């Protein structure tokens, strides 16, 4: 009975931290092996009176108590564990008080209402009266959780305790109390929130510190989601209006970030009458981070309105703000704006997308910054779905040559991936005239991903344009660059063999495809033999039995005892897969 306490006290004092962790992570084993009333009687006062100097053990014991409250004997006997769990609140670390408050959240969740009405209310009212701020943070959390199981008089007592604690001067308990206001009204009725919660909410939003106003405005968006359409205009709406244009930029940054749930909560008439002019005030100010957030939110603000008025407000107010935001001297604002600009295209009608968004599209194409270019070129697929390929192709005619040679390979990657649609729409004659050279230079780039994308692009072209065109215009250049001393150029030619052989045909597979593969399997570079083994492995099934048995089998038995072990293994598994022997 006392020997567990003795080994606990001689084990908690050492050098390392792993041993106490292994002890208290298995303290539930000690409790279940020893008994129930024993650990109610002596072990709980033992863990109260001891004070440790390390923080992670407090986390582990808190979560162990949270998992242990079931092993205590059920919800009826958990009154023994409440003085220790409230004794854990007098700590100085954030993670351990978070673990403590979530443990007490679980305790409040699992437990039958009558002895919450009897016992937890004095405990939360007494730790609410604690002088330390951590006790008040735990108090406002516990008052946020203890609503639905108490009676009306006990309710009104905890409401007036909440007004007693929420009015104090020190800021961190006001932050915690504002967060618990945001979590608090999610369960209340309409009359109590419309009578006393919202005027003191306005009072707490009327103070000076920025962060209490931050937590106040997301508490405002929660209560706007909660309150019906009939009452929010008269009381909390001027509060959020006067909080919209405050002196600090943090509050307008947050109400920009929270603007979408605000406009979803209030309803379209309030958005048109009040939120739109404040939003023109939002993107047209001097701070630039709020401007980037304003672009990030003008995307999902324009997608979420009513149609018959969204068209008018975008043709009347939004587009001049877009034109002003494009010419902004800050760069990150332009990058974010170009990230979220062509999402307006499926929203907006066709000819208006042309006559407004395409000049700014071509403007954002030629910007010297890379992030704006990579964002707009990634969004070119989304604008490509709603705008027909013909006028988009004619728009990208003088802009396709500068974007195939720019520094960043993301833009080149997306241009290569998008190019088959452009070539298929735009015809074969133009590609044979002055557009094949771009793909030819793409096949010999430095970046591997660019070359692999160009090889898949070759697959798309041989699929979309036909057989004899690829015979006349693609294969001889592939062989001429197969005759290149550099090794990775030979790698790209092997990739061309593989990927163009996916469609290809049957006649060219033995008279201009196979012999070049055969004749260069004796290159001293082991990677050449490695990938010619891979190419033979893949190209096996498309070939017929005569060529597969005439010269493929002797070259594969030639390459299966060479010095490098990797090419030997892939030659062996190529012979295994192709069933050559």
């Amino acid at each position: 009975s006392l020997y567990p306490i003795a080994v606990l006290i001689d084990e908690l004092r050492n050098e390392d931290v792993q041993l106490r962790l292994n002890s208290i992570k298995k303290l539930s084993t000690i409790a279940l092996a020893l008994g129930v009333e024993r650990t109610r009687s002596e072990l709980l006062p033992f863990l109260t009176d001891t004070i440790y100097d390390e923080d992670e053990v407090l986390l582990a014991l808190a979560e162990q108590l949270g998992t242990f409250t079931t092993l205590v004997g059920g919800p009826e006997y958990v009154h023994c564990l409440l003085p220790p769990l409230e004794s854990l609140a007098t700590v100085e670390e954030t993670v351990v008080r978070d673990k403590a408050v979530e443990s007490l959240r679980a305790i409040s969740h699992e437990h039958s209402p009558s002895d919450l009405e009897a016992h937890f209310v004095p405990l939360v009212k007494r730790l609410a009266g604690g002088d330390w701020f951590t006790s008040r943070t735990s108090a406002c959390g516990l008052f946020s959780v203890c609503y639905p199981r108490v009676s009306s008089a006990v309710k009104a007592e905890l409401r007036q305790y909440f007004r007693n604690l929420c009015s104090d001067d020190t800021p961190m308990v006001r932050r915690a109390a504002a967060s618990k206001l945001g979590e608090f009204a999610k369960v209340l009725e309409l009359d109590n929130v419309k009578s006393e919660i919202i005027p003191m909410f306005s009072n707490l939003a009327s103070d000076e510190q920025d962060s209490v106003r931050l937590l106040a405005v997301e508490a405002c968006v929660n209560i706007a989601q909660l309150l019906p359409q009939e009452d929010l205009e008269a009381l909390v709406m001027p509060t959020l209006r006067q909080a919209a244009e405050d002196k600090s930029w943090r509050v307008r940054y947050m109400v920009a970030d929270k603007f979408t749930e605000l406009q979803k909560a209030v309803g379209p008439e309030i958005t048109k009458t009040d939120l739109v002019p404040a939003f023109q005030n939002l993107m047209k100010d001097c701070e630039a981070e709020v401007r980037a957030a304003a672009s990030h939110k003008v995307k999902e603000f324009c997608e979420n309105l009513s149609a018959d008025c969204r068209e008018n407000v975008i043709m009347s107010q939004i587009l001049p703000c877009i034109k002003e935001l494009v010419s902004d001297a800050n760069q990150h604002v332009k990058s974010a704006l170009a990230s979220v600009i062509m999402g307006l295209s499926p929203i907006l009608g066709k000819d208006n997308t042309i006559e407004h968004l395409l000049p700014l599209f071509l403007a954002q194409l030629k910007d010297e910054c890379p992030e704006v270019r990579l964002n707009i070129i990634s969004n070119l697929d989304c604008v490509n779905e709603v705008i027909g390929i013909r006028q988009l192709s004619q728009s990208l005619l003088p802009a396709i040559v500068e974007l195939a040679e720019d520094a960043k390979w993301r833009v080149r990657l997306a241009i290569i991936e998008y190019m088959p649609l452009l070539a298929g729409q735009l015809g074969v004659e133009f590609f044979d005239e002055k557009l094949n050279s771009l793909c030819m230079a793409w096949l010999v780039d430095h970046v591997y991903a660019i070359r692999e994308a160009a090889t898949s692009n070759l697959k798309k072209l041989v699929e979309k344009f036909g057989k004899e065109w690829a015979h006349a215009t693609i294969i001889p250049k592939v062989l001429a660059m197969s005759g290149d001393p550099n090794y990775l150029h030979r790698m790209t030619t092997l990739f061309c063999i593989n990927v163009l052989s996916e469609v290809c045909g049957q006649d060219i597979t033995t008279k201009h495809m196979l012999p070049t593969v055969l004749r260069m399997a004796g290159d001293p570079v082991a990677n050449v033999r490695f990938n010619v083994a891979k190419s033979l492995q893949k190209i096996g099934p498309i070939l017929d039995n005569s060529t597969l048995q005439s010269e493929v089998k002797p070259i594969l038995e030639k390459l299966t005892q060479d010095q490098d072990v990797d090419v030997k293994y892939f030659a062996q598994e190529a012979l295994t897969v192709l069933s050559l022997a």
Binding site: E289, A292, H332
Partner: peptide, 6 residues
């Protein structure tokens, strides 16, 4: 570097 992140 226009990212205060506060």
């Amino acid at each position: 570097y226009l990212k205060q992140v506060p």
